[PDB]
């Protein structure tokens, strides 16, 4: 279970019918399946990239300047040219100096002067972009079920099944050995909207840096920044970096302005990041709404026997999952294969099965097996492996793993889960509602209030919450509303 | 020559970003710089509030707007 | 990393000097970035002149506050 | 939860220079370090001239 | 000629030997010797170990990292100030010579 190594975790319950269960797969994120019947599945998105993605605007940030030519003239004798005022690459600035007579005009005034430099770049200072085409793009889906194997981070799950998401590519069936299959119904320009998204790329060499981030295409191309495109010997808008000063009678001077990375890395300030590794663009955010089918799915080894309940010994002791859940892993001594007798007690005299298990149907295979996750309620109880007992306090309170999950579904309703209403199943009058009164105000309030800065959204929305109180119509006093809205939405 | 920030893009996030606890809080540490430096412009907004206004609801939507002015 | 510009002292300069034909014009940039990249929120701002509290002396002092206070 | 990556914020010598609109240069001669902009107070005698 | 100066400050560090010490959440955060020298940035954080890195238990995991912050070559913004001392006004007088 890959779920169990990262904190941003899911659950999804399963009922009798419900077999088509769309999800929401999040990047950096892991959604555990649950379902009376059948056994559990890890979905998760797992990558996001794309193989050498058609590269955009690179920019210039450390400027290289190099045959510093400078022409000046009298005020009427023929204002100042030069012939690498029109080459390429070099970035001129026409301006009057103040002619005396050391400089050796007839004529006093403002007689016309020029400076131009070959405004090459500085080696592997280029901020390049990259852009996602949805026809290459790659969605990266791997599907573990829960086998009782547990397998950490270093190494890699046998029953871990990976399919590949593009748009050559439609909804994958995975031999998940003896479970069943599962499918994978994915919709691939239906996560990260890709028309406006831009992976900046400085200098990967660089050690100490992100490889690659994940920008607004408007704000990708609002740069100031000398710009050109792949193979262009020359650059656009050179003279964003170059500058110069007022001339004293002979020479203007040129001033670069010199590097300006840490202008381009303070100006990312809460963008996320992306993973460059050779050709393969990775991100490390983003979402898709892949929907997942239980349909092939059957719990594995009920023709399995049971185990002797006195040869369970603790591989390892049962702890907190960080989810308000319990993990352990148990390891059986007989005959093997077999089925885990697990249960859990109340400890209120109950001989009462409480386990709300995770992993249904626990067993024990011919090479692995013992993995073992269920949901607790609170106060004592006695997990029973078997006759092997062990005490647990479970530290959750009764409607704290209820405001747990609300704590979940607030910090889910970000930018993905504004998109993300789809993380039920058709709910009719509850989720397709759902999806119609937040796009339609989401979506407005990204049309105008996007662009505009947590400042504004902190202090616009108070002042026209204050234009609530000096408003002179109490009918037209409902704007009051952008209090509730304002301070609210855009805040998280 | 002006690159502008992410205060206005701000996409996504659930991997890994720059300076999320920073970035609302450059500018509540130019305040810092423009109280700090300026301590006598510190008592210089005092005497707004008590000798100039009267006017108790709009005294704090005139001082933290002429802080936050201060670029 | 936090640096504030030398606007502050603008101490001497009767020789050579730096881009001050365009460092007070950066805000003046800034400003019509503003206005020309969110011209539904530009328009958002004459909302407040004709339709609130129009007070003479205070119609100026809100409005071009409101639209420097965007950095 | 095993390795949290350190990053450098890169050179900042453009944003030190974005700092300078307004300043007065001051050249370099070697060992000198020269001023471009100054002033002082002095007083001519011309009594001594012809 | 050549006054004293002040604070430098370096516009580009040069990070080297870097290092995160992490351990599982009650096990010991972790000392570190690169925290006891100059030029040395450190910061105390609290991850969450899983058993994805070996462990026993989850919840905070406590983690710290450590570089040497060193600079880059003739990338430090030197400060001077002036000691009147050795302050030179020059001025240069020249009469009307018909030249
Ligand atoms: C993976 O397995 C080895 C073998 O015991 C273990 O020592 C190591 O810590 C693991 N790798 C990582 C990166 O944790």
């Known amino acids: ?174 031999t998940m050995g003896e479970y069943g299959d599962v499918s994978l119904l994915c919709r691939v320009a239906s996560g990260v909207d890709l028309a406006q998204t831009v992976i900046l790329e400085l200098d990967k060499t660089v050690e100490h840096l992100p490889t690659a981030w994940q920008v607004h295409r408007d704000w990708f191309n609002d740069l100031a920044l000398p710009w050109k495109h792949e193979g262009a010997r020359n650059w656009n808008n050179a003279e964003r970096l170059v500058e110069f000063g007022a001339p004293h009678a002979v020479k203007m001077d040129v001033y670069n302005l010199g590097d300006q990375t840490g202008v381009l890395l303070k100006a990312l300030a809460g963008v996320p990041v992306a993973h460059i590794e050779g050709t393969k663009y990775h991100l490390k955010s983003g979402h898709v709404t892949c929907e997942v089918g239980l349909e092939k799915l059957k719990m594995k080894g009920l023709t399995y026997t049971m185990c002797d309940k006195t040869k369970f010994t603790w591989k390892r002791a049962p702890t907190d999952s960080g989810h308000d859940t319990v993990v352990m892993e148990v390891t059986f001594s007989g005959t093997k294969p077999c089925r885990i007798p697990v249960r859990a007690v109340a400890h209120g005299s109950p001989d009462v099965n409480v386990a709300m298990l995770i992993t249904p149907n626990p067993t024990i295979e011919n090479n692995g097996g013992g993995f073992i996750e269920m949901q607790l309620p609170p106060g004592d109880n006695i997990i029973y492996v078997g006759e092997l007992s062990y005490q647990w306090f479970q530290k959750g309170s009764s409607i704290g793993r209820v405001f747990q999950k609300t704590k979940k579904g607030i910090e889910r309703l970000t930018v993905i889960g504004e998109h993300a209403w789809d993380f039920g199943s058709a709910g009719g009058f509850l989720s397709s509602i759902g999806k119609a009164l937040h796009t339609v105000l989401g979506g407005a309030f990204n049309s105008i209030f996007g662009g505009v800065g947590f400042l504004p959204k902190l202090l616009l929305g108070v002042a026209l919450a204050w234009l609530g109180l000096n408003m002179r119509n109490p009918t037209m006093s409902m704007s009051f509303l952008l209090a509730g809205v304002l301070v609210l939405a855009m805040t998280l | 020559v002006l690159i502008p920030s992410h205060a206005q893009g701000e996409l996504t996030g659930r991997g890994h970003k720059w300076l999320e606890g920073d970035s609302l809080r450059t500018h509540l540490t130019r305040v810092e710089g423009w109280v700090w430096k300026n301590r006598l412009l510190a008592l210089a907004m005092v005497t707004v509030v008590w000798l100039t206004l009267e006017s108790v609801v709009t005294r704090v939507a005139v001082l933290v707007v002429l802080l936050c002015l201060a670029p």
Not at chain 1, 42 to 69: F, G, M
Not at chain 1, 98 to 127: M, P, Q, T, Y
Not at chain 1, 144 to 165: I, L, M, Q, W
Request: aromatic share 6%; proline share 3%.
């Open chain 1, 1 to 174: 279970s890959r779920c169990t190594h990262l904190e941003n975790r899911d659950f999804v319950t399963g009922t009798q019918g419900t077999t088509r269960v769309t999800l929401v797969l999040e990047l950096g994120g892991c959604v555990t399946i649950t379902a009376e019947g059948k056994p559990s599945m890890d979905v998760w998105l797992d990558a996001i990239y794309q193989e050498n993605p058609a590269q955009t605007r690179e920019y210039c940030l450390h400027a290289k300047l190099s045959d510093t030519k400078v022409a000046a003239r009298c005020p009427t004798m023929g204002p100042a040219t030069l012939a690498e005022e029109h080459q390429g690459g070099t970035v001129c600035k026409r301006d009057q100096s103040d002619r005396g007579w050391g400089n050796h005009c007839g004529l006093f005034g403002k007689g016309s002067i020029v400076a131009c430099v070959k405004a090459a770049c500085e080696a592997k200072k280029k901020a390049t972009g990259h852009v996602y085409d949805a026809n290459k793009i790659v969605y990266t889906v791997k599907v573990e079920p829960h086998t009782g194997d547990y397998v950490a981070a270093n190494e890699t799950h046998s029953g871990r099944k990976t399919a590949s998401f593009t748009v050559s590519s439609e909804k994958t069936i995975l």
